[PDB]
Amino acid sequence: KGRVCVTGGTGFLGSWIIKSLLENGYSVNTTIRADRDVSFLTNLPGASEKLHFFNADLSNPDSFAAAIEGCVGIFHTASPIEIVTKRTVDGALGILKACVNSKTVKRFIYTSSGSAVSFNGKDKDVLDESDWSDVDLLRSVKPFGWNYAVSKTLAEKAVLEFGEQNGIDVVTLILPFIVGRFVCPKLPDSIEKALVLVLGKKEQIGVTRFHMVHVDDVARAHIYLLENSVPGGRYNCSPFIVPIEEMSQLLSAKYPEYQILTVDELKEIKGARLPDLNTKKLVDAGFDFKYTIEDMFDDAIQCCKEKGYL
């Protein structure tokens, strides 16, 4: 169905997207972050004939020339981590600049984050694509995770602006906690946090209401937006909003083998109640989510058990 260039190939999301692309008939070009061993990628079905690796540096557009040559799509899932701002903007724009005047790329999809919309200074429990985090507020108030939030906010804004000024069909996906099975060598942070009730202790509880999405639905959304000419722009991809209390009820019933804090034990639990990132825009565009909240937790749990994290 064509060749797609995926950055951050060895990362949790990037590697899953490569797996998905290969399963769906696409060929894949990928750039990765140095740490050695990409066996978990080269062993993926179809990789020995359709997966190709390329050296590149996020800040040098020309270093991406070969990697995007002949590609129908570019999925930019990688990030670098006045000087910090430069590294952030340069890393987000590097491969996008390389895409200028491409004779084949039909869609450039940038991976964003809920951190780019959740720190807006207002107490709104439901957000949409018009909402943005306040960088000035983040830098002055400095809430937990402000550095990452500033990075994501500035990067997404730069991508949208550059795309508009250079006629590139850009789509950005605002992603919440991404959870599911994984093929990468380390336990993804988002999964470790999402499984706090079965993997961690009460002392590790921070977030008490999670916006979430199944990793395979994220891969499916990328392919959908690449194949369907719906409007470019921002799209929340966050079908679930899960209070930790509901999380407890679900996990306690489905996994009685684990010692899980009960709703009663969670009473008056203090923490961050994240906003629901309304995903109506993406659904209105025709995309259909395939997985349920139960599927998401089960895939993550079974994968963790298989790999020794549970």
Q: How far apart are CA 297 and CA 276, in angstroms?
A: 18
Q: How far apart are CA 219 and CA 224, in angstroms?
A: 9
Where do we find the tokens 């290969």? 22
Give the pair of three-digit tokens for residue 236: 């929340």
Q: How far apart are CA 247 and CA 256, in angstroms?
A: 13
Q: How far apart are CA 198 and CA 261, in angstroms?
A: 9
Give the pair of three-digit tokens for residue 122: 């207002």
Among 139, 110, 142, CA closest to 14? 110
Q: Check the annotation: does 9 bind a ligand.
A: yes
Experimental technique for the deposited model: X-ray
* 152 close to 116: Cβ distance less than 8 angstroms: yes
Give the pair of three-digit tokens for residue 304: 């963790």
SS3 letters for the chain?
CCEEEEECCCCHHHHHHHHHHHHCCCEEEEECCCCCCCHHHHCCCCHHHHEEECCCCCCCHHHHHHHHCCCCEEEECCCCCCHHHHHHHHHHHHHHHHCCCCCCCCEEEEEEEHHHCCCCCCCCCEECCCCCCCHHHHHHHCCCCHHHHHHHHHHHHHHHHHHHHCCCCEEEEEECEEECCCCCCCCCHHHHHHCHHHHCCHHHCCEEEEEEEEHHHHHHHHHHHHHCCCCCEEEECCCEEEEHHHHHHHHHHHCCCCCCCCCCCCCCCCCEECCEECCHHHHHCCCCCCCCHHHHHHHHHHHHHHHCCC
Beta bridge partners of residue 4, listed in sequence order: 28, 73
Residue 95's region, left for phi above 0, alpha for psi from -120 to 50, else beta, is alpha
Residue 25's region, left for phi above 0, alpha for psi from -120 to 50, else beta, is left
Q: Check the annotation: does 33 bind a ligand.
A: yes
Q: How far apart are CA 13 and CA 17, in angstroms?
A: 6
The resolution of the experimental structure, rounded to one decimal in Å, is: 1.4
Sign of the dihedral defined by the CA atoms of residues 158, 164, 170, 174, in that order: positive
Torsion of CA 162, 95, 176, 80, to 10 degrees: -110
Where do we find the tokens 């790329």? 105
Query: Can you give the residue range of the structural domain that contains 22?
Result: 1-310
Number of compact structural domains in the chain: 1
Q: Check the annotation: does 12 bind a ligand.
A: yes
Q: How far is CA 167 from CA 6, 89, 105, 180, in A?
A: 21, 18, 12, 35
Among 26, 292, 140, CA closest to 17? 26
Question: Could you tell me how many residues make up the chain?
Answer: 310
Q: Check the annotation: does 14 bind a ligand.
A: yes
Question: How far from each other are the two terminal CA atoms of the chain, in whole angstroms?
Answer: 38
Q: How far apart are CA 177 and CA 215, in angstroms?
A: 9
What's the farthest any 2 CA atoms get from each other in the chain? 59
Neighbours of 306 (CB within 10 A): 10
CATH number for the domain that contains residue 118: 3.40.50.720
- Strand 73-76 with 170-175, pairing: unpaired
* 300 close to 195: Cβ distance less than 8 angstroms: yes
Q: Check the annotation: does 148 bind a ligand.
A: yes
Q: Check the annotation: does 145 bind a ligand.
A: no
